[PDB]
mmCIF file of all heavy atoms in Angstrom:
data_model
loop_
_atom_site.group_PDB
_atom_site.id
_atom_site.type_symbol
_atom_site.label_atom_id
_atom_site.label_comp_id
_atom_site.label_asym_id
_atom_site.label_seq_id
_atom_site.Cartn_x
_atom_site.Cartn_y
_atom_site.Cartn_z
ATOM 1 N N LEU H 1 -49.337 -63.568 -8.823
ATOM 2 C CA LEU H 1 -49.178 -62.109 -8.882
ATOM 3 C C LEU H 1 -47.953 -61.659 -8.068
ATOM 4 O O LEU H 1 -47.804 -62.030 -6.897
ATOM 5 C CB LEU H 1 -50.452 -61.415 -8.362
ATOM 6 C CG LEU H 1 -50.463 -59.878 -8.468
ATOM 7 C CD1 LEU H 1 -50.398 -59.429 -9.930
ATOM 8 C CD2 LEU H 1 -51.699 -59.304 -7.778
ATOM 9 N N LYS H 2 -47.080 -60.864 -8.691
ATOM 10 C CA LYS H 2 -45.865 -60.373 -8.030
ATOM 11 C C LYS H 2 -45.899 -58.853 -7.814
ATOM 12 O O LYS H 2 -46.412 -58.103 -8.643
ATOM 13 C CB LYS H 2 -44.612 -60.728 -8.847
ATOM 14 C CG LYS H 2 -44.321 -62.222 -8.950
ATOM 15 C CD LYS H 2 -42.913 -62.471 -9.498
ATOM 16 C CE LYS H 2 -42.604 -63.955 -9.667
ATOM 17 N NZ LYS H 2 -43.480 -64.604 -10.675
ATOM 18 N N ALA H 3 -45.339 -58.406 -6.691
ATOM 19 C CA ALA H 3 -45.154 -56.974 -6.433
ATOM 20 C C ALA H 3 -43.906 -56.446 -7.164
ATOM 21 O O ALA H 3 -43.189 -57.214 -7.809
ATOM 22 C CB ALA H 3 -45.045 -56.715 -4.936
ATOM 23 N N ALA H 4 -43.647 -55.142 -7.061
ATOM 24 C CA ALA H 4 -42.511 -54.511 -7.756
ATOM 25 C C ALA H 4 -41.167 -55.192 -7.435
ATOM 26 O O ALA H 4 -40.326 -55.365 -8.315
ATOM 27 C CB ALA H 4 -42.443 -53.026 -7.409
ATOM 28 N N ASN H 5 -40.976 -55.587 -6.174
ATOM 29 C CA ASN H 5 -39.734 -56.251 -5.746
ATOM 30 C C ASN H 5 -39.717 -57.746 -6.147
ATOM 31 O O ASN H 5 -38.881 -58.520 -5.677
ATOM 32 C CB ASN H 5 -39.551 -56.082 -4.228
ATOM 33 C CG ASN H 5 -38.141 -56.411 -3.760
ATOM 34 O OD1 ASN H 5 -37.240 -55.583 -3.832
ATOM 35 N ND2 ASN H 5 -37.936 -57.613 -3.260
ATOM 36 N N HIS H 6 -40.667 -58.141 -7.001
ATOM 37 C CA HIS H 6 -40.685 -59.478 -7.632
ATOM 38 C C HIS H 6 -41.049 -60.584 -6.622
ATOM 39 O O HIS H 6 -40.722 -61.758 -6.813
ATOM 40 C CB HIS H 6 -39.324 -59.760 -8.298
ATOM 41 C CG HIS H 6 -39.338 -60.889 -9.287
ATOM 42 N ND1 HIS H 6 -38.965 -62.177 -8.971
ATOM 43 C CD2 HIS H 6 -39.665 -60.909 -10.601
ATOM 44 C CE1 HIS H 6 -39.060 -62.937 -10.043
ATOM 45 N NE2 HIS H 6 -39.483 -62.196 -11.045
ATOM 46 N N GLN H 7 -41.760 -60.194 -5.570
ATOM 47 C CA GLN H 7 -42.198 -61.123 -4.517
ATOM 48 C C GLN H 7 -43.582 -61.715 -4.839
ATOM 49 O O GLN H 7 -44.390 -61.081 -5.520
ATOM 50 C CB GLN H 7 -42.252 -60.372 -3.179
ATOM 51 C CG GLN H 7 -43.310 -59.271 -3.146
ATOM 52 C CD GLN H 7 -43.072 -58.246 -2.056
ATOM 53 O OE1 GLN H 7 -43.545 -58.385 -0.930
ATOM 54 N NE2 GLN H 7 -42.354 -57.195 -2.395
ATOM 55 N N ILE H 8 -43.859 -62.919 -4.336
ATOM 56 C CA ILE H 8 -45.145 -63.589 -4.586
ATOM 57 C C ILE H 8 -46.211 -63.136 -3.577
ATOM 58 O O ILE H 8 -46.238 -63.597 -2.434
ATOM 59 C CB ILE H 8 -45.004 -65.135 -4.515
ATOM 60 C CG1 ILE H 8 -44.001 -65.638 -5.565
ATOM 61 C CG2 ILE H 8 -46.363 -65.817 -4.704
ATOM 62 C CD1 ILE H 8 -44.446 -65.417 -6.996
ATOM 63 N N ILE H 9 -47.079 -62.223 -3.999
ATOM 64 C CA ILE H 9 -48.138 -61.701 -3.122
ATOM 65 C C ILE H 9 -49.470 -62.441 -3.325
ATOM 66 O O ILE H 9 -50.284 -62.531 -2.403
ATOM 67 C CB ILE H 9 -48.353 -60.182 -3.340
ATOM 68 C CG1 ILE H 9 -48.736 -59.893 -4.801
ATOM 69 C CG2 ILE H 9 -47.101 -59.403 -2.938
ATOM 70 C CD1 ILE H 9 -48.946 -58.427 -5.103
ATOM 71 N N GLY H 10 -49.690 -62.969 -4.531
ATOM 72 C CA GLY H 10 -50.932 -63.685 -4.826
ATOM 73 C C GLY H 10 -50.721 -64.958 -5.645
ATOM 74 O O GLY H 10 -49.777 -65.054 -6.428
ATOM 75 N N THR H 11 -51.614 -65.932 -5.466
ATOM 76 C CA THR H 11 -51.547 -67.212 -6.197
ATOM 77 C C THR H 11 -52.952 -67.752 -6.494
ATOM 78 O O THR H 11 -53.766 -67.900 -5.589
ATOM 79 C CB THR H 11 -50.751 -68.277 -5.396
ATOM 80 O OG1 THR H 11 -49.389 -67.853 -5.228
ATOM 81 C CG2 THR H 11 -50.776 -69.636 -6.093
ATOM 82 N N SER H 12 -53.234 -68.036 -7.762
ATOM 83 C CA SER H 12 -54.565 -68.521 -8.173
ATOM 84 C C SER H 12 -54.665 -70.052 -8.145
ATOM 85 O O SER H 12 -53.653 -70.761 -8.137
ATOM 86 C CB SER H 12 -54.909 -68.013 -9.577
ATOM 87 O OG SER H 12 -56.164 -68.511 -10.009
ATOM 88 N N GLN H 13 -55.898 -70.558 -8.146
ATOM 89 C CA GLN H 13 -56.143 -72.002 -8.128
ATOM 90 C C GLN H 13 -56.262 -72.573 -9.551
ATOM 91 O O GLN H 13 -56.922 -71.992 -10.415
ATOM 92 C CB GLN H 13 -57.423 -72.340 -7.338
ATOM 93 C CG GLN H 13 -57.434 -71.848 -5.889
ATOM 94 C CD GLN H 13 -57.831 -70.386 -5.757
ATOM 95 O OE1 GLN H 13 -56.995 -69.490 -5.757
ATOM 96 N NE2 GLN H 13 -59.118 -70.134 -5.641
ATOM 97 N N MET H 14 -55.619 -73.720 -9.770
ATOM 98 C CA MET H 14 -55.662 -74.438 -11.054
ATOM 99 C C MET H 14 -57.077 -74.467 -11.684
ATOM 100 O O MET H 14 -58.016 -75.032 -11.117
ATOM 101 C CB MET H 14 -55.148 -75.869 -10.836
ATOM 102 C CG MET H 14 -55.867 -76.610 -9.710
ATOM 103 S SD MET H 14 -55.136 -78.219 -9.345
ATOM 104 C CE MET H 14 -56.148 -78.742 -7.961
ATOM 105 N N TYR H 15 -57.216 -73.841 -12.858
ATOM 106 C CA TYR H 15 -58.492 -73.819 -13.590
ATOM 107 C C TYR H 15 -58.624 -75.029 -14.529
ATOM 108 O O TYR H 15 -57.666 -75.773 -14.740
ATOM 109 C CB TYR H 15 -58.620 -72.524 -14.405
ATOM 110 C CG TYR H 15 -58.621 -71.262 -13.563
ATOM 111 C CD1 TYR H 15 -57.446 -70.547 -13.341
ATOM 112 C CD2 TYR H 15 -59.793 -70.784 -12.987
ATOM 113 C CE1 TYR H 15 -57.444 -69.398 -12.576
ATOM 114 C CE2 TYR H 15 -59.797 -69.634 -12.222
ATOM 115 C CZ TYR H 15 -58.621 -68.945 -12.019
ATOM 116 O OH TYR H 15 -58.621 -67.798 -11.251
ATOM 117 N N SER H 16 -59.813 -75.217 -15.096
ATOM 118 C CA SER H 16 -60.061 -76.328 -16.028
ATOM 119 C C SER H 16 -59.658 -75.964 -17.463
ATOM 120 O O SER H 16 -58.817 -76.626 -18.075
ATOM 121 C CB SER H 16 -61.543 -76.728 -15.994
ATOM 122 O OG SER H 16 -62.380 -75.638 -16.356
ATOM 123 N N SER H 17 -60.278 -74.918 -18.004
ATOM 124 C CA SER H 17 -59.981 -74.450 -19.366
ATOM 125 C C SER H 17 -59.067 -73.217 -19.346
ATOM 126 O O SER H 17 -58.989 -72.504 -18.340
ATOM 127 C CB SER H 17 -61.279 -74.093 -20.104
ATOM 128 O OG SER H 17 -61.914 -72.967 -19.510
ATOM 129 N N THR H 18 -58.381 -72.960 -20.458
ATOM 130 C CA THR H 18 -57.553 -71.753 -20.586
ATOM 131 C C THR H 18 -58.421 -70.494 -20.498
ATOM 132 O O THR H 18 -58.061 -69.518 -19.838
ATOM 133 C CB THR H 18 -56.767 -71.725 -21.919
ATOM 134 O OG1 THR H 18 -57.676 -71.709 -23.032
ATOM 135 C CG2 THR H 18 -55.845 -72.934 -22.035
ATOM 136 N N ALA H 19 -59.580 -70.540 -21.157
ATOM 137 C CA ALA H 19 -60.552 -69.444 -21.118
ATOM 138 C C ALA H 19 -60.978 -69.119 -19.676
ATOM 139 O O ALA H 19 -61.112 -67.949 -19.313
ATOM 140 C CB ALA H 19 -61.772 -69.784 -21.972
ATOM 141 N N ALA H 20 -61.191 -70.154 -18.859
ATOM 142 C CA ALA H 20 -61.518 -69.969 -17.436
ATOM 143 C C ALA H 20 -60.463 -69.106 -16.729
ATOM 144 O O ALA H 20 -60.792 -68.225 -15.935
ATOM 145 C CB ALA H 20 -61.644 -71.319 -16.737
ATOM 146 N N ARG H 21 -59.195 -69.367 -17.036
ATOM 147 C CA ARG H 21 -58.082 -68.612 -16.453
ATOM 148 C C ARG H 21 -58.141 -67.125 -16.838
ATOM 149 O O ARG H 21 -58.156 -66.249 -15.974
ATOM 150 C CB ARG H 21 -56.748 -69.202 -16.924
ATOM 151 C CG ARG H 21 -55.520 -68.475 -16.377
ATOM 152 C CD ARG H 21 -54.268 -68.818 -17.173
ATOM 153 N NE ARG H 21 -54.397 -68.433 -18.579
ATOM 154 C CZ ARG H 21 -53.435 -68.510 -19.457
ATOM 155 N NH1 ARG H 21 -52.269 -68.971 -19.126
ATOM 156 N NH2 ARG H 21 -53.651 -68.128 -20.670
ATOM 157 N N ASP H 22 -58.176 -66.849 -18.139
ATOM 158 C CA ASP H 22 -58.146 -65.470 -18.640
ATOM 159 C C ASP H 22 -59.431 -64.689 -18.287
ATOM 160 O O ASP H 22 -59.377 -63.481 -18.030
ATOM 161 C CB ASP H 22 -57.886 -65.475 -20.149
ATOM 162 C CG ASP H 22 -56.476 -65.960 -20.472
ATOM 163 O OD1 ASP H 22 -56.261 -67.189 -20.545
ATOM 164 O OD2 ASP H 22 -55.572 -65.114 -20.637
ATOM 165 N N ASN H 23 -60.578 -65.369 -18.264
ATOM 166 C CA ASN H 23 -61.818 -64.752 -17.771
ATOM 167 C C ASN H 23 -61.716 -64.482 -16.266
ATOM 168 O O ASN H 23 -62.186 -63.454 -15.768
ATOM 169 C CB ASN H 23 -63.046 -65.623 -18.081
ATOM 170 C CG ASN H 23 -63.541 -65.435 -19.505
ATOM 171 O OD1 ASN H 23 -64.346 -64.551 -19.785
ATOM 172 N ND2 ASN H 23 -63.075 -66.260 -20.416
ATOM 173 N N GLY H 24 -61.088 -65.409 -15.545
ATOM 174 C CA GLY H 24 -60.787 -65.182 -14.141
ATOM 175 C C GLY H 24 -59.960 -63.917 -13.940
ATOM 176 O O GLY H 24 -60.296 -63.078 -13.107
ATOM 177 N N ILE H 25 -58.896 -63.773 -14.736
ATOM 178 C CA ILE H 25 -58.030 -62.583 -14.701
ATOM 179 C C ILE H 25 -58.835 -61.282 -14.881
ATOM 180 O O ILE H 25 -58.608 -60.300 -14.172
ATOM 181 C CB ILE H 25 -56.924 -62.660 -15.790
ATOM 182 C CG1 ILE H 25 -56.041 -63.904 -15.570
ATOM 183 C CG2 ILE H 25 -56.075 -61.387 -15.792
ATOM 184 C CD1 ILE H 25 -54.977 -64.101 -16.632
ATOM 185 N N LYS H 26 -59.775 -61.275 -15.829
ATOM 186 C CA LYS H 26 -60.643 -60.105 -16.034
ATOM 187 C C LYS H 26 -61.409 -59.760 -14.744
ATOM 188 O O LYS H 26 -61.521 -58.589 -14.355
ATOM 189 C CB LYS H 26 -61.630 -60.349 -17.187
ATOM 190 C CG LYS H 26 -60.956 -60.638 -18.529
ATOM 191 C CD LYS H 26 -61.958 -60.660 -19.686
ATOM 192 C CE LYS H 26 -63.019 -61.745 -19.521
ATOM 193 N NZ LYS H 26 -63.996 -61.749 -20.647
ATOM 194 N N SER H 27 -61.929 -60.791 -14.080
ATOM 195 C CA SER H 27 -62.601 -60.619 -12.787
ATOM 196 C C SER H 27 -61.621 -60.089 -11.731
ATOM 197 O O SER H 27 -61.934 -59.154 -10.997
ATOM 198 C CB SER H 27 -63.212 -61.947 -12.314
ATOM 199 O OG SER H 27 -64.148 -62.447 -13.260
ATOM 200 N N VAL H 28 -60.425 -60.684 -11.688
ATOM 201 C CA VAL H 28 -59.368 -60.281 -10.745
ATOM 202 C C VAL H 28 -59.032 -58.790 -10.872
ATOM 203 O O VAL H 28 -58.902 -58.083 -9.875
ATOM 204 C CB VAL H 28 -58.069 -61.091 -10.978
ATOM 205 C CG1 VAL H 28 -56.965 -60.666 -10.008
ATOM 206 C CG2 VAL H 28 -58.335 -62.585 -10.869
ATOM 207 N N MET H 29 -58.879 -58.316 -12.105
ATOM 208 C CA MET H 29 -58.599 -56.900 -12.342
ATOM 209 C C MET H 29 -59.751 -56.021 -11.839
ATOM 210 O O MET H 29 -59.523 -54.969 -11.246
ATOM 211 C CB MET H 29 -58.334 -56.637 -13.832
ATOM 212 C CG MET H 29 -57.110 -57.367 -14.374
ATOM 213 S SD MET H 29 -56.679 -56.865 -16.053
ATOM 214 C CE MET H 29 -58.158 -57.333 -16.954
ATOM 215 N N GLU H 30 -60.988 -56.471 -12.058
ATOM 216 C CA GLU H 30 -62.169 -55.713 -11.626
ATOM 217 C C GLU H 30 -62.290 -55.634 -10.089
ATOM 218 O O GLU H 30 -62.454 -54.552 -9.524
ATOM 219 C CB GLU H 30 -63.450 -56.338 -12.187
ATOM 220 C CG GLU H 30 -64.691 -55.495 -11.917
ATOM 221 C CD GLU H 30 -65.986 -56.275 -12.037
ATOM 222 O OE1 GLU H 30 -66.482 -56.454 -13.167
ATOM 223 O OE2 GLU H 30 -66.520 -56.695 -10.990
ATOM 224 N N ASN H 31 -62.227 -56.786 -9.417
ATOM 225 C CA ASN H 31 -62.479 -56.850 -7.965
ATOM 226 C C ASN H 31 -61.197 -56.705 -7.126
ATOM 227 O O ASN H 31 -61.245 -56.221 -5.998
ATOM 228 C CB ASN H 31 -63.211 -58.153 -7.606
ATOM 229 C CG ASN H 31 -62.507 -59.404 -8.104
ATOM 230 O OD1 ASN H 31 -61.295 -59.443 -8.244
ATOM 231 N ND2 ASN H 31 -63.271 -60.440 -8.381
ATOM 232 N N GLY H 32 -60.060 -57.116 -7.679
ATOM 233 C CA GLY H 32 -58.781 -57.017 -6.969
ATOM 234 C C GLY H 32 -58.426 -55.594 -6.526
ATOM 235 O O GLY H 32 -57.540 -55.395 -5.693
ATOM 236 N N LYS H 33 -59.117 -54.603 -7.085
ATOM 237 C CA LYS H 33 -58.890 -53.196 -6.735
ATOM 238 C C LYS H 33 -59.938 -52.685 -5.724
ATOM 239 O O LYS H 33 -60.092 -51.477 -5.535
ATOM 240 C CB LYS H 33 -58.925 -52.329 -8.007
ATOM 241 C CG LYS H 33 -60.274 -52.333 -8.724
ATOM 242 C CD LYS H 33 -60.288 -51.409 -9.946
ATOM 243 C CE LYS H 33 -59.569 -52.005 -11.155
ATOM 244 N NZ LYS H 33 -58.104 -52.176 -10.948
ATOM 245 N N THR H 34 -60.654 -53.608 -5.074
ATOM 246 C CA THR H 34 -61.709 -53.233 -4.115
ATOM 247 C C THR H 34 -61.140 -52.919 -2.725
ATOM 248 O O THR H 34 -60.039 -53.345 -2.376
ATOM 249 C CB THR H 34 -62.791 -54.335 -3.961
ATOM 250 O OG1 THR H 34 -63.921 -53.817 -3.234
ATOM 251 C CG2 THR H 34 -62.245 -55.559 -3.225
ATOM 252 N N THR H 35 -61.907 -52.176 -1.933
ATOM 253 C CA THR H 35 -61.500 -51.811 -0.568
ATOM 254 C C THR H 35 -62.201 -52.677 0.490
ATOM 255 O O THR H 35 -61.904 -52.576 1.681
ATOM 256 C CB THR H 35 -61.806 -50.325 -0.268
ATOM 257 O OG1 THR H 35 -63.214 -50.075 -0.403
ATOM 258 C CG2 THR H 35 -61.033 -49.405 -1.209
ATOM 259 N N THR H 36 -63.137 -53.521 0.056
ATOM 260 C CA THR H 36 -63.874 -54.401 0.977
ATOM 261 C C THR H 36 -62.976 -55.531 1.508
ATOM 262 O O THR H 36 -62.751 -56.536 0.829
ATOM 263 C CB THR H 36 -65.128 -55.018 0.304
ATOM 264 O OG1 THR H 36 -65.975 -53.976 -0.205
ATOM 265 C CG2 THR H 36 -65.922 -55.877 1.290
ATOM 266 N N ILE H 37 -62.455 -55.355 2.723
ATOM 267 C CA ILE H 37 -61.565 -56.344 3.346
ATOM 268 C C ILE H 37 -62.131 -56.842 4.689
ATOM 269 O O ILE H 37 -62.371 -56.053 5.606
ATOM 270 C CB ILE H 37 -60.148 -55.756 3.582
ATOM 271 C CG1 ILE H 37 -59.556 -55.230 2.262
ATOM 272 C CG2 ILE H 37 -59.228 -56.807 4.206
ATOM 273 C CD1 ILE H 37 -58.197 -54.578 2.411
ATOM 274 N N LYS H 38 -62.328 -58.155 4.799
ATOM 275 C CA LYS H 38 -62.863 -58.774 6.019
ATOM 276 C C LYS H 38 -61.751 -59.455 6.837
ATOM 277 O O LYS H 38 -61.027 -60.303 6.316
ATOM 278 C CB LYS H 38 -63.925 -59.820 5.655
ATOM 279 C CG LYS H 38 -65.118 -59.264 4.879
ATOM 280 C CD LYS H 38 -66.086 -60.374 4.467
ATOM 281 C CE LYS H 38 -67.300 -59.827 3.723
ATOM 282 N NZ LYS H 38 -68.167 -58.991 4.595
ATOM 283 N N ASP H 39 -61.609 -59.081 8.110
ATOM 284 C CA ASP H 39 -60.679 -59.769 9.007
ATOM 285 C C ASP H 39 -61.389 -60.926 9.737
ATOM 286 O O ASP H 39 -62.387 -60.719 10.435
ATOM 287 C CB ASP H 39 -60.080 -58.783 10.026
ATOM 288 C CG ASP H 39 -59.028 -59.429 10.917
ATOM 289 O OD1 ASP H 39 -59.399 -60.202 11.824
ATOM 290 O OD2 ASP H 39 -57.823 -59.174 10.718
ATOM 291 N N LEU H 40 -60.878 -62.140 9.556
ATOM 292 C CA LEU H 40 -61.416 -63.334 10.227
ATOM 293 C C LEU H 40 -60.390 -63.911 11.220
ATOM 294 O O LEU H 40 -60.509 -65.053 11.671
ATOM 295 C CB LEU H 40 -61.788 -64.401 9.180
ATOM 296 C CG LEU H 40 -62.747 -63.935 8.070
ATOM 297 C CD1 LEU H 40 -62.993 -65.056 7.065
ATOM 298 C CD2 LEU H 40 -64.064 -63.443 8.664
ATOM 299 N N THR H 41 -59.387 -63.104 11.561
ATOM 300 C CA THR H 41 -58.288 -63.550 12.432
ATOM 301 C C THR H 41 -58.548 -63.179 13.896
ATOM 302 O O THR H 41 -58.431 -64.015 14.795
ATOM 303 C CB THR H 41 -56.936 -62.933 11.993
ATOM 304 O OG1 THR H 41 -56.907 -61.523 12.282
ATOM 305 C CG2 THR H 41 -56.703 -63.143 10.502
ATOM 306 N N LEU H 42 -58.899 -61.916 14.122
ATOM 307 C CA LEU H 42 -59.182 -61.407 15.465
ATOM 308 C C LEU H 42 -60.497 -61.993 16.006
ATOM 309 O O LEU H 42 -60.560 -62.493 17.133
ATOM 310 C CB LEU H 42 -59.267 -59.875 15.422
ATOM 311 C CG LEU H 42 -58.057 -59.170 14.782
ATOM 312 C CD1 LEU H 42 -58.337 -57.684 14.599
ATOM 313 C CD2 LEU H 42 -56.795 -59.388 15.617
ATOM 314 N N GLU H 43 -61.540 -61.927 15.185
ATOM 315 C CA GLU H 43 -62.849 -62.491 15.526
ATOM 316 C C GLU H 43 -62.900 -63.985 15.163
ATOM 317 O O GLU H 43 -62.333 -64.412 14.155
ATOM 318 C CB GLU H 43 -63.957 -61.704 14.791
ATOM 319 C CG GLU H 43 -65.084 -61.196 15.694
ATOM 320 C CD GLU H 43 -66.080 -62.275 16.095
ATOM 321 O OE1 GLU H 43 -65.696 -63.220 16.814
ATOM 322 O OE2 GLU H 43 -67.254 -62.186 15.684
ATOM 323 N N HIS H 44 -63.590 -64.775 15.981
ATOM 324 C CA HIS H 44 -63.625 -66.233 15.813
ATOM 325 C C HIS H 44 -64.568 -66.660 14.667
ATOM 326 O O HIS H 44 -65.600 -67.290 14.893
ATOM 327 C CB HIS H 44 -64.041 -66.900 17.135
ATOM 328 C CG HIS H 44 -63.956 -68.402 17.126
ATOM 329 N ND1 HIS H 44 -64.939 -69.209 16.601
ATOM 330 C CD2 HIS H 44 -63.002 -69.242 17.594
ATOM 331 C CE1 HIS H 44 -64.602 -70.472 16.749
ATOM 332 N NE2 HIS H 44 -63.429 -70.525 17.350
ATOM 333 N N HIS H 45 -64.207 -66.308 13.436
ATOM 334 C CA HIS H 45 -64.960 -66.743 12.250
ATOM 335 C C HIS H 45 -64.096 -67.662 11.374
ATOM 336 O O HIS H 45 -63.713 -67.307 10.257
ATOM 337 C CB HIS H 45 -65.461 -65.538 11.436
ATOM 338 C CG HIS H 45 -66.511 -64.723 12.131
ATOM 339 N ND1 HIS H 45 -67.813 -65.144 12.275
ATOM 340 C CD2 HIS H 45 -66.452 -63.501 12.714
ATOM 341 C CE1 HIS H 45 -68.509 -64.226 12.909
ATOM 342 N NE2 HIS H 45 -67.710 -63.219 13.190
ATOM 343 N N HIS H 46 -63.786 -68.845 11.901
ATOM 344 C CA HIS H 46 -62.930 -69.807 11.204
ATOM 345 C C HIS H 46 -63.699 -70.488 10.060
ATOM 346 O O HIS H 46 -64.332 -71.522 10.254
ATOM 347 C CB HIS H 46 -62.408 -70.847 12.206
ATOM 348 C CG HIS H 46 -61.291 -71.703 11.686
ATOM 349 N ND1 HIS H 46 -61.468 -72.996 11.244
ATOM 350 C CD2 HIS H 46 -59.966 -71.448 11.561
ATOM 351 C CE1 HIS H 46 -60.305 -73.497 10.876
ATOM 352 N NE2 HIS H 46 -59.376 -72.582 11.057
ATOM 353 N N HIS H 47 -63.664 -69.881 8.876
ATOM 354 C CA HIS H 47 -64.411 -70.390 7.717
ATOM 355 C C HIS H 47 -63.806 -71.688 7.154
ATOM 356 O O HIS H 47 -64.517 -72.661 6.917
ATOM 357 C CB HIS H 47 -64.464 -69.324 6.615
ATOM 358 C CG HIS H 47 -65.262 -69.738 5.414
ATOM 359 N ND1 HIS H 47 -64.686 -70.137 4.226
ATOM 360 C CD2 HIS H 47 -66.601 -69.817 5.219
ATOM 361 C CE1 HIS H 47 -65.631 -70.442 3.359
ATOM 362 N NE2 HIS H 47 -66.799 -70.259 3.936
#
């Protein structure tokens, strides 16, 4: 995923099937617009 200035802001993981990719994209569009953001940097939650 690139921003307006053509920079790389997001990168997906290699899928198995082509359908997996495009179905993933549908999910990405749905949830990628969410406001739920968890910070694991300040607090010691090294997942």
Side-chain angles (χ1 to χ4, degrees):
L1 184 63
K2 294 193 182 64
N5 195 83
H6 197 264
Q7 65 199 270
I8 300 295
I9 59 181
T11 297
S12 178
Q13 303 82 268
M14 53 186 177
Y15 298 95
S16 59
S17 66
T18 62
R21 180 197 60 174
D22 292 84
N23 279 272
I25 300 177
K26 300 189 299 179
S27 301
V28 180
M29 297 188 299
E30 187 199 278
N31 54 29
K33 63 177 77 294
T34 192
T35 60
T36 304
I37 304 177
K38 300 176 178 293
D39 184 286
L40 305 178
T41 71
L42 307 171
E43 232 283 65
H44 187 278
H45 292 286
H46 193 258
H47 183 256

